[PDB]
Subunit: 309 residues, 6 copies
Amino acid sequence: PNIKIFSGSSHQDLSQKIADRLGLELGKVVTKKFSNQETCVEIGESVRGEDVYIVQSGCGEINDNLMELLIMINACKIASASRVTAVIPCFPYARQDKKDKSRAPISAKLVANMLSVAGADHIITMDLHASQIQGFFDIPVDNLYAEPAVLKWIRENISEWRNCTIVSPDAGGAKRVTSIADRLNVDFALIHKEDRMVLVGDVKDRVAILVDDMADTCGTICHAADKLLSAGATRVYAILTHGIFSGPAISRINNACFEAVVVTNTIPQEDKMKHCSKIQVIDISMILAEAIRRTHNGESVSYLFSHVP
Amino acid sequence: PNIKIFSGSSHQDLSQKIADRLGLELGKVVTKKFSNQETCVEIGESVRGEDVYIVQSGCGEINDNLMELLIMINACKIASASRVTAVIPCFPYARQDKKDKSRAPISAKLVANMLSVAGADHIITMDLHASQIQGFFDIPVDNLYAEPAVLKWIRENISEWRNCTIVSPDAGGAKRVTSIADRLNVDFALIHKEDRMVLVGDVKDRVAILVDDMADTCGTICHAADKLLSAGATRVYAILTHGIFSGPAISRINNACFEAVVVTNTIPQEDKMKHCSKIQVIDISMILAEAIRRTHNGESVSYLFSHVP
Amino acid sequence: PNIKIFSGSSHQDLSQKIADRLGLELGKVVTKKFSNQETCVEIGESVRGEDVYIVQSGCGEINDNLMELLIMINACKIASASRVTAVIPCFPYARQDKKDKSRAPISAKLVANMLSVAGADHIITMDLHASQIQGFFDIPVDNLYAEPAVLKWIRENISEWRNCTIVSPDAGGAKRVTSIADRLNVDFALIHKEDRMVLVGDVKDRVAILVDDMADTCGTICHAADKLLSAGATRVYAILTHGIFSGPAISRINNACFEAVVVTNTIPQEDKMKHCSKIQVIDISMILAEAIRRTHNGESVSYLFSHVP
Amino acid sequence: PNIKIFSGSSHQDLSQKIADRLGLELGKVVTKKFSNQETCVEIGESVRGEDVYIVQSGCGEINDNLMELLIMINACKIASASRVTAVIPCFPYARQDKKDKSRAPISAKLVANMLSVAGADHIITMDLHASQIQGFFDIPVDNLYAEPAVLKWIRENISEWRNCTIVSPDAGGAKRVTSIADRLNVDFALIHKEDRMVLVGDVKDRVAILVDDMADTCGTICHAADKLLSAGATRVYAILTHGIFSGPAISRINNACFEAVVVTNTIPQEDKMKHCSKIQVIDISMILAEAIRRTHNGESVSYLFSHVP
Amino acid sequence: PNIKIFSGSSHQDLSQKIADRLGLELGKVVTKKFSNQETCVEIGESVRGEDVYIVQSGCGEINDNLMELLIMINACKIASASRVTAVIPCFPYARQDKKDKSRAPISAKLVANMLSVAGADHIITMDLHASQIQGFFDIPVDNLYAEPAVLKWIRENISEWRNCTIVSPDAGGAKRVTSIADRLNVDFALIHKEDRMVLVGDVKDRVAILVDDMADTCGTICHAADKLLSAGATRVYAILTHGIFSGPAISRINNACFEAVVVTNTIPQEDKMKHCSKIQVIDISMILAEAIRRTHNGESVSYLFSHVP
Amino acid sequence: PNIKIFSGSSHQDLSQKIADRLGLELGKVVTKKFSNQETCVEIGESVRGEDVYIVQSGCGEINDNLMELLIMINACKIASASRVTAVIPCFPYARQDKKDKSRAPISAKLVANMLSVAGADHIITMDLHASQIQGFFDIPVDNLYAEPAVLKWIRENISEWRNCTIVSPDAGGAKRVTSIADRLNVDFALIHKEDRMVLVGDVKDRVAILVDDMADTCGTICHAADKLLSAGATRVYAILTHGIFSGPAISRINNACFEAVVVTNTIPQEDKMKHCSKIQVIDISMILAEAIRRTHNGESVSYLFSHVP
Ligand SMILES: O=P(O)(O)OC[C@H]1O[C@H](OP(=O)(O)OP(=O)(O)O)[C@H](O)[C@@H]1O
Ligand SMILES: O=P(O)(O)OC[C@H]1O[C@H](OP(=O)(O)OP(=O)(O)O)[C@H](O)[C@@H]1O
Ligand SMILES: O=P(O)(O)OC[C@H]1O[C@H](OP(=O)(O)OP(=O)(O)O)[C@H](O)[C@@H]1O
Ligand SMILES: O=P(O)(O)OC[C@H]1O[C@H](OP(=O)(O)OP(=O)(O)O)[C@H](O)[C@@H]1O
Ligand SMILES: O=P(O)(O)OC[C@H]1O[C@H](OP(=O)(O)OP(=O)(O)O)[C@H](O)[C@@H]1O
Ligand SMILES: O=P(O)(O)OC[C@H]1O[C@H](OP(=O)(O)OP(=O)(O)O)[C@H](O)[C@@H]1O
Ligand SMILES: [Mg+2]
Ligand SMILES: [Mg+2]
Ligand SMILES: [Mg+2]
Ligand SMILES: [Mg+2]
Ligand SMILES: [Mg+2]
Ligand SMILES: [Mg+2]
Ligand SMILES: [Mg+2]
Ligand SMILES: [Mg+2]
Ligand SMILES: [Mg+2]
Ligand SMILES: [Mg+2]
Ligand SMILES: [Mg+2]
Ligand SMILES: [Mg+2]
């Protein structure tokens, strides 16, 4: 069985980068829409007995991309692929992970069920919003971390990183920032709202680094940056693995006081970078390519949790 | 257990009509989008131990409506509804029912699987494109027919209906037109392409009635009407249960020679009727309401196959 | 994993031919009946870690053959075969594919479910009655076509095939005859009943070729041939992939006006050819052997759709 | 929900008796064969929201009856019956319950899986060959015992029953005969082969009563009776819940030395009683009717294990 | 269908209290061990057609209690109970909800799968460690909150509760304490370690109230109380819904500086209260009884989230 | 894929022996308990793409061992092992294989379901209490026999084995002793209770050999030995594949009249052999190692049924 890399419509640049780092060409697939807005998927090459990897991120027009992904998975499954893996850098509906005193659907579980019934045997994703989403599946799920690439960017871009601070925008981000701080050996502050917020950890004359999993409307990071500047921090950085940047996000970032908003390219950012000069992008295509290659060859994937390939 | 009728965003008028004919109010549900194009569903009333019916048609923005439908089904299922029924007047991806020498997905089967895994116990649909789609499910599926309402419209709108002709636009429509002709006791012609088409059945000075399950781009009915006028038919009618009317459909119908294009309101048509004066709408909300009420009360549903309620 | 070919009792000649074209011996299996009409299956050789193919056609005593097939599949599955494929040249209950205004079971879906629960991982079949039956399974199904062999027979047996006609006995056979006509570049007529039938397409002094998927009682092809001779066609041919030939079929064919009734050997025909001199048999064992070999080696199976091996 | 009793073709007399004892008419169902030996099932009445019980015994042409039963179950399930129960007085393939050093299928497990996937929610059966077959299902299975009716027959037919003996034909029948002996307060002998057999338990001048679950070829009971007459027993009785009586059974019983071979009517015996004057039949239709009625009303079914209704 | 309440061995007092508040007697069940440490479960009364609720908490000898619970669920399911609900006040293995850079099992998902395959249709639990565990099931899960009873205890036991503080022992407890503070309208502090910890929120001369979901070894609450006394708080309270109190917990609490450690009786505490004078118990049996009664009657269960019954 | 052998806590000696005979080291796994009696499992090496075999016997603290086994299976399954096999020398809850007129759970079926849902693809076990337990699974189950090793021990330890007797303690053990006798060509006696028991088969001055599948409380073998000494047998032997030896077993064996109680090491016996001088142990680790190696290499496993490796 050989590796076949297929791209959805959501993130073609990421898929091309991944295929480049594996020494492959993207698989021949036509993904369009009929006139009635129905997804049309045609696998243009035989995938019989192959190790198929479909790259599709939960971004853009989310329901359309998810439908395309499910249809591609099912097409490869009934075309007798030996194994079908969904490479989903940003997991759709990941924030619908709990009910919490509401008659709300756990939409992430529904997405996991639909991926399972489409025929996915393996999920590769990056920085799941909640790790418990791994339990929503009955198939193996590899949850990669952008932390190696984030630390690399911090070291090569913040000259004052030995005295800097790693700040979480909310309580739920504590573990990630603590890990980052430990690997950098730096002090780590915290922030949480009460319309007011409290920041704990000395930041005066010290660079603050907000680290968080995603920014959708950027209310969280903007409030955090406001408070960080209240406490007299010199410069403020925001680092995110998923730059959804929906709605008022670009205007808020433009009107905010960040020195940089760094995001990983799990979501295409070219358009967002057009209208916001302070957005920078970390390439994580090497981590995804390495994970695909290690799952194919049966090598350890947890090695990546601590090493940049 | 009491009937609860919930509407999706796709066809709110149809749901309101159905709820009216059942003497009910639509269930309290909020269906919106987050900023990142993610479906948000909130059931505003308890459905515990109730007989929930969700009305949503595979029209408009199809993937968005299907995702909303699945999310609503799952929300009602994990909110402890006794039974959840998906009322899907136009089944999405119904035309993806077969592979036919292509590495194509059978998307209709995938939709059936997703409806099953969301937790639907019953499907009510109208004029499935292929009856074999009933076999795609492991739950009961009630496939209603618009034929009663179609015959009623023909009798009350075509004064020459005793001498008229019932014509199929393609080979695959033969059974429906034969049934219509038998119930009307009329001659039935046929049409099939060869860029040329052949029409069999005397139509000169006789009204032709094209009857078909759906019109998406209206190429089929337009070519059929062209040939019918070649054979000297006096007036031409098109009757359809699903008026998708996507892409060039409205321009083609406006430039065509139909005396009327009649469709059933399984899909909202107000916007299409705005730009096409020859589209008429048959109400089928009574058939849907009667089917919902008969499934709830345990009465025979196959009774509707031959009787207008 | 090596190929293991096992034969059921239904079609031993076809299985022997397939094993010959693969350079193999039929697997050692004892398939008998106990005194109480219960199927006894004993695999006489280890199938552990092997690629098992069971050849059994939905013919003869259909329920007995289907039970034998399911029992063999389950026996090979719990004997730790790596993969079990059911090679079913004529699919049993394929005509029970829809409900259609009746409280009828979709027996084809039930057969698919039973094949899945017995443990089949792959289905190879020839000319399914409805392509939507592929959607009845959640495993891959390869639906081979007899069209290559049919065209070969037509070219090597009908000297007037460049001016001939390809006729469908009913509406539902349109696609197959159109494909045959296109590959032969000939005119294609059509036939459908109204006790009367209408034939469209010039056939005078031209050979008519009825092409259809199966003949059970041969009422369809006999009525079609009657009408074709009404329209003054010189000679009439019937070509079928499945020659069930049950009940009054042999008498009807003997009393009919066919120049030949050609069938493919998906069903044993020796006994039927004994009592009907006009039945000819096309060997399709090469297509089945090639499909088995290509699924085993991971080569493209859709290649066969257009090429005789 | 009301009780609906449907009969298969296998045992129409038993179904009529059961329906009589419930004060019902048999449900309107047409069960025939097409010309190609395919089972045709048509439910002639609505079963929507009803409590359907299908009576079909694993006798006669076993695969045909099992296919008819599965098709009826599936038909009632997709016709929206509230609950479908398979009343299977003699379970087909029950003797294929284990592998035992052979590459043999556990056909009973396959039958259980097929009954589950057809949609059966409940199984009612009588004197399963192995009680572990109850574990083959994931649905509830009620395994009734003929012991009450057997004791009633013994008391009303063997005037010497207080001094009689209850003998098992093999080792595997020990539990049943011990229970019978305990409820009668009699001595219980045993028999097992070594071509020779040994009988333990004084039987001279005492009536021996062979008790066993089934007689297929009657080799077991005939050898047991031979040995019992070797040990000087006065008269020999055989009592069985399932009289399959296949192959040489009738000749063996006619040439044997039984005073009576008593069987319960889980299998039709009219034809067998025609050619064997020593076969008597115990009616167990009251136990089946009582079990159906108690499962419908939610009353205790285990009550029947000790009481004749 | 009537309510049947069955008790496991884990928490018999809680089950008796629940049955008292429902006006019922505990169902007749024998739960013992064979000599080989195997769980023996015998339902002593018919549960056919009943609404069975099994009360068993993930406490004590956890694997033994979980096995007993699964065996009871399966026993009631194959005894034809209409519906089986597992009332699990403390969910076993709830802390194994994620992998987090380790080759660790998500044991909570495994427990959910085993509960589903045993046949549970409904789960009632109290204060799940992670709300995402609700997504581990495909059946409805009601996750009750002890917050109403906790607020009642605070108001009736801390006379200074209008000026008090609600403190979280770690970051992951933020939401619960914020909700408690909002319903009390009090300031809410926070605590998190760095061997050092930082407390944010003025506590001098103010009572601190640690609120957390569980205390296993009481390291978390003991460190939090140490820091709270470092910041000069007058008195310190710990409130917990699950008092596991394993290992060194009792010694730590005895050597700590709590004014009270309040726990809810989801776990039996009589033995722990024997050796620790500062443990108090909040009865939550009324919430569990009300939830059972509301699920049985189809009334709203989410009503309890805000109201003490 | 390479063989990985993992040991549970139940039988570490057996796992080490098996790993020795395969030329491997035991896989690196930490299996402990948290303070709250919760199983903690950590796979210390990557199992990605490997053939994992977990050795764990249903002995000792049975529920704890079973939970550890399920947790290990699930851990290896979601760690992307190619195939996971549970090597279960003594199957837990195997004696709960039937209901038999009681509202008892079929706990063996529940254990099979839990093993399946944890993700086991293959079961290797030795001398299942009932062979029908193989039907409780839908995955392949290899049921090895200790008979080869038992015959080897008998021949090398009982000098009078050509004139000896093979005795079954109950009726249900008949098949095993008959097979042993046939392979030894010896007379075979039988024993069954009536507080009295009857022994059939001449044993005077002849060594009796009780052969049975397990001894839990040793009541069965002790009563059998008492009767055998009543019939004047010279010496009495008991041979068992599973020496559970729970409760009063050791005292009964010490007070009994066995010349030897031989057991196979499917359960650790060091502690039991400490307090009972007449217990001897047959090593069966070679059979288990050979079965593991043959399933890995795809060689015939049924070969072992008749040959000592
Ligand atoms: O739309 P924005 O203002 O950019 O906010 C996006 C936030 O949503 C998520 O947090 P969530 O609110 O789910 O809290 P949690 O991380 O504690 O679950 C995520 O951690 C971001 O912080
Ligand atoms: O987009 P339009 O030009 O309006 O055509 C829509 C057609 O699609 C379907 O037919 P299909 O082509 O699937 O053939 P079938 O009905 O024979 O399956 C349907 O019956 C309509 O005739
Ligand atoms: O028993 P016979 O007279 O030989 O007829 C057999 C016919 O049955 C099938 O057609 P069907 O009637 O199912 O129509 P369809 O092909 O349009 O579905 C098949 O296409 C044959 O034409
Ligand atoms: O065909 P016949 O000669 O009438 O024999 C039928 C026998 O088959 C069954 O026993 P089986 O041989 O399965 O042994 P068991 O009851 O110990 O499993 C049953 O108990 C009958 O005794
Ligand atoms: O054994 P103890 O010292 O009493 O600690 C028990 C802690 O475990 C859980 O927290 P966890 O460590 O899982 O963190 P989380 O709540 O943030 O997930 C829980 O919230 C308790 O605080
Ligand atoms: O606890 P002990 O006194 O050692 O008895 C253990 C007995 O249990 C099993 O027999 P069972 O009673 O299940 O009868 P069966 O073998 O006929 O099923 C097994 O065959 C042993 O003989
Ligand atoms: Mg969140
Ligand atoms: Mg957050
Ligand atoms: Mg079509
Ligand atoms: Mg059409
Ligand atoms: Mg047809
Ligand atoms: Mg046809
Ligand atoms: Mg038997
Ligand atoms: Mg027997
Ligand atoms: Mg935690
Ligand atoms: Mg915590
Ligand atoms: Mg037993
Ligand atoms: Mg025994």
